Amino acid sequence: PDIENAELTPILPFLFLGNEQDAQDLDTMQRLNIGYVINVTTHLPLYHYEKGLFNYKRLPATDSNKQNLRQYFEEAFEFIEEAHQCGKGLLIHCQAGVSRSATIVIAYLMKHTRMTMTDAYKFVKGKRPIISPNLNFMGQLLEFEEDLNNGVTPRILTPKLMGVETVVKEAAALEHH
Numbered sequence: 487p488d489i490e491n492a493e494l495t496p497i498l499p500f501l502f503l504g505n506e507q508d509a510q511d512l513d514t515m516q517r518l519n520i521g522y523v524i525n526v527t528t529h530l531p532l533y534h535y536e537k538g539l540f541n542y543k544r545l546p547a548t549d550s551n552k553q554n555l556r557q558y559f560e561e562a563f564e565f566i567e568e569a570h571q572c573g574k575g576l577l578i579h580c581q582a583g584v585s586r587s588a589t590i591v592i593a594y595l596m597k598h599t600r601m602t603m604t605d606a607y608k609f610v611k612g613k614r615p616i617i618s619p620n621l622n623f624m625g626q627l628l629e630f631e632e633d634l635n636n637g638v639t640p641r642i643l644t645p646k647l648m649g650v651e652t653v654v655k656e657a658a659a660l661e662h663h
């Protein structure tokens with residue numbers, strides 16, 4: 487509880503990070519032009535699925551110290567890019583939007599923005615303070631960051647994304663860290 491009943495966080499113009507609440511808030515979603523959802527849990531339902539409005543993708547993971555989240559990065563990344571590729575907004579969430587969801591977004595910012603693991607972590611954190619991936623996930627993000635830098639993973643730096651202004655705010659924010 488406490489500060490945990492936070493508001494849906496906008497990471498990028500087309501990328502939002504939230505909790506199981508925001509996952510249910512059909513009004514905000516349609517308002518924000520959400521067309522895609524990623525549910526990073528195994529037990530929560532794909533809210534509003536029946537309504538046949540958005541496209542979904544579940545990354546069946548728990549916030550355990552044993553969970554493998556890497557296995558899902560690539561997949562989650564495409565789905566995020568698909569939503570991007572076509573003017574739709576994407577909402578990613580888990581339970582509290584505190585550990586699992588965040589790890590995915592941080593990883594994302596890493597792969598598509600040669601941003602450091604710490605910069606990405608700080609960036610997302612800046613916009614959503616409650617953020618706190620678990621040490622298991624932190625290590626995976628560390629490995630991932632190493633993998634990116636050594637090239638064993640195709641870092642996609644295609645301008646296919648962000649417009650100038652977006653990149654500027656991004657850059658300006660990292661300057662604050």
Ligand SMILES: [Cl-]
Pocket residue numbers: 549580581582583584585586587
């Ligand atoms: Cl969580």
